[PDB]
Amino acid sequence: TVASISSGPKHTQKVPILTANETGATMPVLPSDSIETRTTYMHFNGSETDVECFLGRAACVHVTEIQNKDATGIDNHREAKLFNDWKISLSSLVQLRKKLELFTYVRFDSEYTILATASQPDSANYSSNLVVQAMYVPPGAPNPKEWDDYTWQSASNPSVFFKVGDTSRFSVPYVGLASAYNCFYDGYSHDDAETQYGITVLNHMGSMAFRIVNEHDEHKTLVKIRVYHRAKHVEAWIPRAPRALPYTSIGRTNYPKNTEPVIKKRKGDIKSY
Amino acid sequence: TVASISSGPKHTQKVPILTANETGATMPVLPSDSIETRTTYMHFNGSETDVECFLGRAACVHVTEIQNKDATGIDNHREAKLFNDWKISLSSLVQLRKKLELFTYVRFDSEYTILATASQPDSANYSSNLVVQAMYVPPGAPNPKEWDDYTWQSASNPSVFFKVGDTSRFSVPYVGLASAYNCFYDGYSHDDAETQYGITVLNHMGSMAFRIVNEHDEHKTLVKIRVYHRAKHVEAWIPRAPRALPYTSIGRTNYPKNTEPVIKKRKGDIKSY
Amino acid sequence: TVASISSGPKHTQKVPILTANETGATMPVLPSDSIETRTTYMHFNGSETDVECFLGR
Amino acid sequence: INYYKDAASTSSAGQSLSMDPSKFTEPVKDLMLKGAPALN
Amino acid sequence: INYYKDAASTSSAGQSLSMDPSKFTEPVKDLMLKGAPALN
Amino acid sequence: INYYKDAASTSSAGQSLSMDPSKFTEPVKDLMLKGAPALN
Amino acid sequence: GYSDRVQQITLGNSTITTQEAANAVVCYAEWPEYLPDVDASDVNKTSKPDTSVCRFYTLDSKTWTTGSKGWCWKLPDALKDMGVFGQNMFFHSLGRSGYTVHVQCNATKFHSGCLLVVVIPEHQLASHEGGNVSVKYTFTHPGERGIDLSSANEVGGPVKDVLYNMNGTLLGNLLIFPHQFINLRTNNTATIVIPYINSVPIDSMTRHNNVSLMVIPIAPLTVPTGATPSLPITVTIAPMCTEFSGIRSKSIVPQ
Amino acid sequence: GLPTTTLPGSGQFLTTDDRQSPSALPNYEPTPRIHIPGKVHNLLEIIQVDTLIPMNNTHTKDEVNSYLIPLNANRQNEQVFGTNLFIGDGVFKTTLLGEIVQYYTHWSGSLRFSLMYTGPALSSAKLILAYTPPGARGPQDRREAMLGTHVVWDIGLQSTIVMTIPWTSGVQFRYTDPDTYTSAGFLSCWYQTSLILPPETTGQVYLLSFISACPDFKLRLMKDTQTISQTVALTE
Amino acid sequence: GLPTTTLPGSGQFLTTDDRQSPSALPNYEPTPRIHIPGKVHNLLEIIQVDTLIPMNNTH
Amino acid sequence: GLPTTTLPGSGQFLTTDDRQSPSALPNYEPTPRIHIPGKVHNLLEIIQVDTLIPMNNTH
């Protein structure tokens, strides 16, 4: 492939460099339209800019935490982190979010990796070996109330059991209701005067519940869960302007008030180098 | 292959042993040009002197250390080794450095092995099990400020998570900007009167950041990281004189003052055996 | 596979929507027996409702 | 590839792709045609 | 070799090697030739 | 068998078995024959 | 003698002529088309009023003055009240449509000024409150009036800051969306053909707007000496290939 | 039982590796795809669309005005604007090009810089745009500027001028992030003759300026952008 | 000895995965199947049989 | 699931072994090679060039 062809002096009536940008086109002008060039080859394919590659590496999408401790006398397991739960989403953390929102609709399979590490902040004789159980609780299915409810039987709901310190990995097909996931949605769930605006109403994916299977030892053990997400088989439509201001909320476009100028001011003139 | 052919008495006008070294050549003289020889075969190929073999074994290129401890009240994580960082380079340690600098330009893929072991120098009930996370922070990308920054999300930057005591291994393609890496560079980054001289300005590879993912236990744990590097797919150009004096700095050729004579003095005469 | 065929106005002596449930049958009535439909395809096989799948986790 | 000798040890079965609701939805002795009168 | 039955479980896809910027760079209704005048 | 997609991930290269010292041992412009006088 | 410059668009019972055009943009290089069966889901036969809905409606005019910040209309909202298009809209459960948008602004060879005319698929607005305040319905359904970016923040309304496109992105990059400029010195109209863009084959026309049309002054209007300091901008829009499905009782929407 | 040996790296999680995994939802059937205009395959497809450069960066809070380069009637010989070409920083940084370049470590290729004139139709002007390849200082006067890559632009019916910064380089890749060794030059613009307004007209006229990449362009070695960060996870 | 590398997920138990296992009862012979009317293959077969709706829910 | 047995040496790191590894930079394209005079393939090539011997070591 040639990156530049050889081109010499020109004295024409045919001027490729004068255009009318009002038309909305970006005319494909090249170095050889306005200087004299020599042949050179590309030596490159643009492999690593493919959208599959761009969205295809694992990104941390969520960090939660649960603890193993005596539940005796706990009136609210959920509240004691005896078993936390997460509202599956892909915008709570922003590195990956800005990347996805370069597109309007996106379609892909997900590969999740879940790393779990334990901490024992206060005096323990040892490090126990805990097994985590993460359940998929899609919307419409009983959601766990205690850390050892009938729910955890999970007879119809996919669940994975792995050890703290290890990693769990599995992959979920594209579960969207439509043909693509909306990265943006300028609508409502119905014509209500006070219903919420945005996509919050659209990515009704449900939540995922984590717990330790082990009963309690004499000390307490903090287990912190990190969920990583990798898109595989990516398809993206309609590019948009990149995110400039900071994010404030999952699912709304809102930016913070009295934010700071995002364009760097010159130290000098327009004329400055 | 014959290592020596059979050759007998000679009384010629054709003298292969008289030459003129002023020409710059090393004339290919053999035993059979000046004594009577018998046939012998080589029985050998020179396999283990191939440059791929010479540069192809893992060498320790870096030892760093980070600790897991309560960051509560630490004003400078980087400074507490709550997460160290390394300026990828291949000359900080010298065994491998002398080997590479036998050549001027070198091109290869790298295979890294990272061994991490833990130490608990002061009273602990136990040994905790820590997961290390090493990130590749190429130049232009946010560099970590605390041990748990958004940076560690590493949504676009390759990172590996492995356990202390284990080893991590992955391989990076030749990331040089030019066609080869310069082992030497007699230039500057620009014609500045005070800019630095050397290659420091050329092997702008960026750095690699390590941290423990675990929160803190009651005791403190020292984790010491050793990075090993193995060249694979090696290509080397222009041999040079081997390094004689000791090294003083990454990237400059400078040797120490009042160094010692590097040539061993005879215990005796020129005539001595 | 078609999920619905195209069907238009009807003025017949042949009424598929009147039945006698006392018989014990569930007559296979479709949208196209009582409204005007357009063609659409199924795009689906019913894979995940197989009893092997239902009892297989 | 089965690595094991016994049939019980093989993985899940593969979709019937059988599907015939008529034993349940139309177990009538004399065939009913949709469109023809139910009771003649 | 896929070891698994479902398509979601396969590795990353392979490069589009599609690449056609004209839907974005030249969505004009009447074709513009480089070198010819923009507005006639 | 390569298990990985990228070339960097393959094992070490295999012996040049190239070997030609003359660029280093005899870079002279006019060819010198062993046995003939060095300087004529 | 055809110029890129003169054009005629006849759609239904209405025709537009421009003698100073700058080509026309067809979003993503695709022209509006009906919904194919292979893509269909709802089993209902759809209704295609054709020429009674696919004609040109001219919205009420705006006034560009030196202080203008820009205006924003949403589709199909802007047309919610135009003739039979609008009736069909409130009466069917689902509908689908593409449009031809023609923005008009003429001046003289002594004026200067340049407007950006852009179509943004799925333009989800931001609340000026920050945090996770929502933007109430009424605020994102201004109707033919559209939203006036130089109007004041209101409560439950969107933010109207132009350097941020009403969503946290910079004005400068709106050029990645199908768009055309109106530069008084060149141009006097902008025309964009919009194909139907959605993640579902057909949708509700009232709970979801699928494009915002935005006209933004970028090089300020500068009139000749002692000229009146303002110009009107007119927007005329025509639904094209419209289809409605799932007819019934007639939606009732807030406010 | 087949004998195996495990190698160094066993059990590691590399966020960039690509392997198979069991599906959690065996046998599930995804929604059919329908057609949607606009599919993107390569980021290289989109960085060829031009977007506006806030060249007039001299303000103090972001404003529509930093997109406008002003021009003065009747000045002769003088300089319209100047900038270095660190596409990952400074004016370029918020543009779509700048914004994507920042996801990669290295770039190579030609850039296309165009200027669209917005002055009254009855005015006229001749400007010179100059590209100064690495190695010299930003030009200080047109004489200096005109000795490097340049285009005399004659403002006419055809409203925009497209200047190309042809790839001039020893090393075949440059870092996006400002490197010296790797630096690309300067871009300046001066009056060639001068802007002239018709009667009954007055004041400043402005140029809009765009940037996009030529088909020439290469970007490699993905990394994280300095353009976005956060201090606590967001919630709904 | 063939060189291997284990990936993330090793040792996990996913209730939905489908693999082979050793039989605890090697060589055992199950009872023959006889014919039984009524076999169900898909839940889609049975949701087409109609059943009564307690529409008058007001009690 | 295929039955395996691990041998002595599993998990060891031998600095001299030569195996495959995952690439951290999937799909990256290295700079083209250009021609450079002087390529060395074997250390045996270079030890045939003669160099001076500090024979007079007595200093």
Ligand SMILES: Cc1cc(CCCCCCCOc2ccc(C3=N[C@@H](C)CO3)cc2)on1
């Ligand atoms: C055990 C176990 C646990 C699980 C979880 C199953 C995965 C379900 C999650 C499905 C994917 O979720 C989303 C959510 C949001 C988005 C998304 N939001 C927009 C910004 C873009 O994409 C995409 C996928 O499965 N088995």
Ligand SMILES: Cc1cc(CCCCCCCOc2ccc(C3=N[C@@H](C)CO3)cc2)on1
């Ligand atoms: C996780 C994770 C961590 C990483 C690191 C990626 C590797 C980047 C390093 C690239 C190779 O670096 C160098 C540096 C210097 C030299 C060199 N200097 C001269 C003496 C010779 O060679 C060669 C390669 O990747 N993924």
